[PDB]
Design a protein around this ligand. Structure first.
Ligand SMILES: [Br-]
Ligand SMILES: [Br-]
Ligand SMILES: [Ca+2]
Ligand SMILES: [Ca+2]
Ligand SMILES: [Cl-]
Ligand SMILES: [Cl-]
Lengths: 675, 681
């Protein structure tokens, strides 16, 4: 009989453990490039002296050796270079074989076949399939990350923390990346088979999958549904009918599965952190060390002049014209890999932004931009350096505009309000790690200014009255809003100040929703005198136009005769009533544990359409949706439910409580699961 | 000023599209007979009431009205008989004219002139030339084929499939008809001006070009180079020095172009499917619906009253006499047209065979033969019915002949081993369509027996039938058969009597050519077994690569024979022709296929031998994918080694296209590869 294969033992557990791919729920053989994996192949006879076995691996719809998307290699006693198979031992008809792949191999799904030369003939049989991913553990892989703890956080951690809020108060929300949850890896890999690039030229696209710079850019385009091809639909209108309020999501898992389940139609709706969390899931799952970055006072310079304008009218009203030019915060991602296209000094973290803001080469894609390059103002380098540089360095120009007279006039310029407290979750804890100093030099330093001049050069070759808005007491949805406008006359003359104030509910990016309060006043201030004007906005006044952001834009345009106006600005955040989660016993793998959701209605009216949503990788499979009955005024809602720990370690339970009067109330709970 | 033509607008694109001749690469005006075409003729002035225009068309060297090779017709307001010109509109000095031709007009190249009668004088000017072809779309045309699907296949399709192999395994080879490729129509038209018929009497030959029976028959004569006039030179010797191995060709395109290019000397070399593929190109190009037929176990000799003899000696050797009388398969063609010379019931498919076999009317030409007429045994009708009927109905008589004693004796008769699985490519797909029931009635039916007697009766002492052979034999193949691997067979013997008999077995193995041409003995042996009543036994036959490789030809065929004998009883002959597969050869397109966009293709091959493979040449072609034939030299390929060849193709026509490749090297001549490709706009 001719030489043939009887069975193949992929020793999946062993290899996946060695390749650090064992956390994936899948049962498939998952591997990382440039690393050896061992298989046992039982033949029907002994390897003849004149017989030969040649392995064949291929990926994509047009496997080609010249494109590195196909490889043919013989069984040897020594390792070649890229792909190779070494016979380490023979026991009976069983051949212990160690297969190797090149550190530069394209990632994705592969098929392995075996060609057998025996008895003057040739036979071919398919051995099976496997998944190949980037290898942050391999020193020669472009995504190499040498530090153990860092790699665990940027690749293996499926529980995250995203910072939000504003410069006045940095808050945070938990996010379930869940890259290891069932079918998530699969879906993320399929994204590459659905890109505009793939449709344009499948052969070249798959061959380019050996480049994290390429895979990263494609993902930044595919995470949004713009260009009629992607996952998430952006919506910053404050009205989310026909979809889900962006702030209600707790992770990337539901978004990706819903995307697949709906035949790849847009998932409604998401905002920047939602795009970032989902992008982070794709990057980590594929093997690209990545993390979520939040930039506060993030600007959108549309005409590449490193400057943005914000307008107000004399009545103190913010104008749509630029109300969203400087977001309270904006979230994006950073990917870790070298930049062979830029040089040895631009490796490391690379900015990737999936939020559809600026079109790049005609498509809503953004990055990879070297963070180090951004810090030095080398904006001619790929990709999208000008836009990203502006997000953290732009100047903010305040304008006054009177539509009635058609006149417009410069009020002031601030070169440092934009690009503050750039944050990311610390390695191994929920602490806030500030990485502002990574994106730019200290405000005031020469470098800061030298860099700015540098970048700009490449793109385009006294008030007597001081004001400040202060928050009085606690701000929470249901309670009245109390503020104070503090004014002081610094001149030696008595001044008469005319004050025009407004309050508008907004979306975090600055989208103006509706006026909820306005007032004016005239105060006479003596030299050096300080006066306060109280600002009170009741719940009845703002509740009707307040959105899930729980934000209000307070503005005070003050003016003294013969002097330029003085604009006082302040975006405030009202806290949602508290929502709490509590485990009612010790947590242990595969053992049910009861949990408790606590919530008290602070309103004088009942709260209806109450829905509780809970999830957490390693604690629960998927999303748990619980309908909660109408809760009367001052009443408490006690909800109980069980979770079933499946993986030991420090886990994260997340919940969303949405009702007619309170959309997207969030709750987070850290749980240590024991073996 | 006298009336005169300033210019003429043939509206070539418009007319060719309407006439279904737009696929031809040519720029010329190509039209079909019996169908109107419109022209715009700009005169120097308005057409006067007392002026007149006479159109004049002519074809051939001796155009005459009486011969229909010349026609003179006036510009009128109503259409008429054969040729006619109708003035549809007059704008300024431009005349919109609709010219019509008769459905019985001779095909070929025409010249059109204009005679103008003006101011008491007569002027004449040549307008131009055009090509007239048969019109399968016209109901009154003898080649009319009403069904859309069939017509597209039998006329418009330039990619084909020809079935080959044997009754034990029907294989298939792709063929590039390429009737639309550059110069092909011109060359096929030129054949008519080169026939023995044309040289004899050009006047009559040309006038006969209005008849598909005539054109078809002439083509059957000119596709072969016999009679010192024609295209392909046959060669079934297994040695093709000075020419090309018949199995290496992939189409009719290189063949016809080589013919023209060589000054019309013989193209070496071809075998039946090559003649058929080439004849198919000519037929489709000229407008005659046609297809390729393959008859397995085809009677090539049988010139002795519907019967062929095959001889063997007692040692089990096949004898040269009759070894090639019954080809494993023979390929020919069928043309679609009415038979006004035979009657209304004989129209349809007509057998046409360009393979030089039997001389007819002093020339190597064959057909047309009504397929319906063959089925009915009406072998008195033209043309060559006796022979074609025999190819599919002949009896096969096996003989034993001992040279030493000069004695020969009938072994057995098989009235149904010949004429099997007659096949042709299905309409629209590569599927195999069996048409055996179209050539003859089922075996066992009284119909086929009646027809046989009938046919036999129109053509032109005791063999006591013994008792059951007692010994039954059959040869079976063990494992796959491939060039490079050893051949393994098993002779199964069974004693059906009940007295325990002793059997002497003499076996041999001869490499052959598909037609039966014996090449060389590569194995022989003998055995004497004793079988008890009802007992079965099996003798193993093994032939190593080393033993046959030296004498195996591109056919990769071997004739296995076993002469078995029991005392006091006629011998039992067991025969089996086998086929060894070539190593795999595969083609891979490395991207989507789109019109006018280059795409890379990959040639994949692995040498299964323990020795190198040299003089490797890759030949690729496919109408609508490449212009002509791409020849690629491939470096010496080592043992168990793989070849990595890439090359680009450039789709030029959307639709399902067929890429063909031939890979020949010193150890493996003519390995074939086929790949269907969908080209989008
Ligand atoms: Br605040
Ligand atoms: Br066979
Ligand atoms: Ca998109
Ligand atoms: Ca001839
Ligand atoms: Cl998966
Ligand atoms: Cl031509």
């Amino acid at each position: 009989a001719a030489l043939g294969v009887q069975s193949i033992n992929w020793q999946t557990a062993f290899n996946r453990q060695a390749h650090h791919t064992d956390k994936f729920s899948s049962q498939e053989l998952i591997l990382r490039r440039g690393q050896n994996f061992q298989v046992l192949m039982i033949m029907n006879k002994g390897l003849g002296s004149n017989e030969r076995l040649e392995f064949i691996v291929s990926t994509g719809p047009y496997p080609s050796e010249s494109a590195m998307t196909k490889a043919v290699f013989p069984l040897s006693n020594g390792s070649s270079g890229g792909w190779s198979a070494v016979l380490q031992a023979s026991n009976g008809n069983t051949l212990t074989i160690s297969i190797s792949s090149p550190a530069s191999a394209p990632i994705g799904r592969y098929t392995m076949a075996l060609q057998i030369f025996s008895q003057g003939g040739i036979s071919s049989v398919k051995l099976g399939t496997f998944i190949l991913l980037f290898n942050p553990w391999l020193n020669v892989d472009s995504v190499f990350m040498g530090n153990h703890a860092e790699r665990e956080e940027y690749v293996q951690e499926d529980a995250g923390i995203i910072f939000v809020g504003s410069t006045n108060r940095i808050g945070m929300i938990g996010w379930n990346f869940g890259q290891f949850e069932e079918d998530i890896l699969s879906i993320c890999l399929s994204i590459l088979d659905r890109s505009l690039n793939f449709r344009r030229d499948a052969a070249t696209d798959v061959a380019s999958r050996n480049d994290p710079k390429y895979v990263g850019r494609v993902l930044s385009a595919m995470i949004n549904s713009n260009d009629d091809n992607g996952v998430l639909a952006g919506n910053w209108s404050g009205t989310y009918t026909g979809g889900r309020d962006p702030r209600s999501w707790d992770g990337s898992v539901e978004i990706l599965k819903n995307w697949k389940k709906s035949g790849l139609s847009p998932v409604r709706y998401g905002q920047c952190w939602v795009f970032a969390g989902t992008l982070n899931t794709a990057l980590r799952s594929l093997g690209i060390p990545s993390r979520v970055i939040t930039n506060f006072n993030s600007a959108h310079d549309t005409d590449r002049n490193l400057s943005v304008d914000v307008y107000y009218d004399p009545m103190g009203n913010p104008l749509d014209k630029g109300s969203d030019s400087v977001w309270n915060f904006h979230v994006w991602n950073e990917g870790w890999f070298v930049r062979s296209d830029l040089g040895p000094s631009y490796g490391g973290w690379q900015v990737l932004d999936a939020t559809p803001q600026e079109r790049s080469q005609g498509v809503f894609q953004c990055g990879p931009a070297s963070v180090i390059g951004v810090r030095e103002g080398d904006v001619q380098l790929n990709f999208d350096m000008p836009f990203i540089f502006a997000e953290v360095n732009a100047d903010r120009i305040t304008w006054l505009y009177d539509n009635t007279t058609g006149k417009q006039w410069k009020n002031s310029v601030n070169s440092h309000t934009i690009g503050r407290y750039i944050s990311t979750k610390a390695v191994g804890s929920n602490a806030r790690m500030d990485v502002t100093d990574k994106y730019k030099y200290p405000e005031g330093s020469d470098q800061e200014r030298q860099v700015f001049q540098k970048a700009l050069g490449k793109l385009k070759p006294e008030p007597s009255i001081i004001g400040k808005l202060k928050v009085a007491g606690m701000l929470a949805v249901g309670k009245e809003v109390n503020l104070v406008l503090l004014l002081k006359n610094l001149s030696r003359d008595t001044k008469t100040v005319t004050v025009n104030m407004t309050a508008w509910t907004i979306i975090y990016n600055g989208t103006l929703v509706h006026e909820v309060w306005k007032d004016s006043a005239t105060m006479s201030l003596d030299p050096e005198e300080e006066a306060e004007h109280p600002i009170k906005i009741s719940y009845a006044q703002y509740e009707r136009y307040l959105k899930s952001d729980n934000m209000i834009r307070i503005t005070a345009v003050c003016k003294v005769p013969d002097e330029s106006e003085v604009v006082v600005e302040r975006d405030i955040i009202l806290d949602n009533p508290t929502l709490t989660l509590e485990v009612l016993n010790e947590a242990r793998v595969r053992k049910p544990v009861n949990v408790q959701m606590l919530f008290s209605n602070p309103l004088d009216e009942p709260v209806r359409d109450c829905v509780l949503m809970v999830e957490g990788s390693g604690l629960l499979l998927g999303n748990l949706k619980i309908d909660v009955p109408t809760l009367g005024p001052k009443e408490r809602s006690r909800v109980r439910f069980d979770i079933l720990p499946s993986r030991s370690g420090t886990k994260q339970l997340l919940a969303d409580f949405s009702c007619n009067k309170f959309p997207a109330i969030k709750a987070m709970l850290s749980i240590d699961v024991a073996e």
